[PDB]
Amino acid sequence: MRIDKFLQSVGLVKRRVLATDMCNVGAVWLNGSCAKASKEVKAGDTISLHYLKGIEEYTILQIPALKNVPRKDTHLYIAPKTKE
Secondary structure (H helix, E strand, O other): OEHHHHHOOOOOOOOOOOOOOHHHHOOOEEOOEEOOOOOEOOOOOEEEEOOOOOOEEEEEOOOOOOOOOOOOOOOOOEEEOOOO
16 A cells, blocks of 8 residues: 555545656655655555645554545544644
């Protein structure tokens, strides 16, 4: 599992292109560091995302090693970081 197919195959960003743009646009960021579309992710880690409306930093709860996580078990592997 990698940031490429991790957050792109969970239900966050759906697209149809053989060329990873998230890694080019500057959205792919692991551990507060820019990463390409070939960087493997780990459990209990962080997941940054760059957008035009604002930035989002999620956290990996675990790595189930899945291909396309539907809208059922896609709420126990990654979640938006926060401090209440």
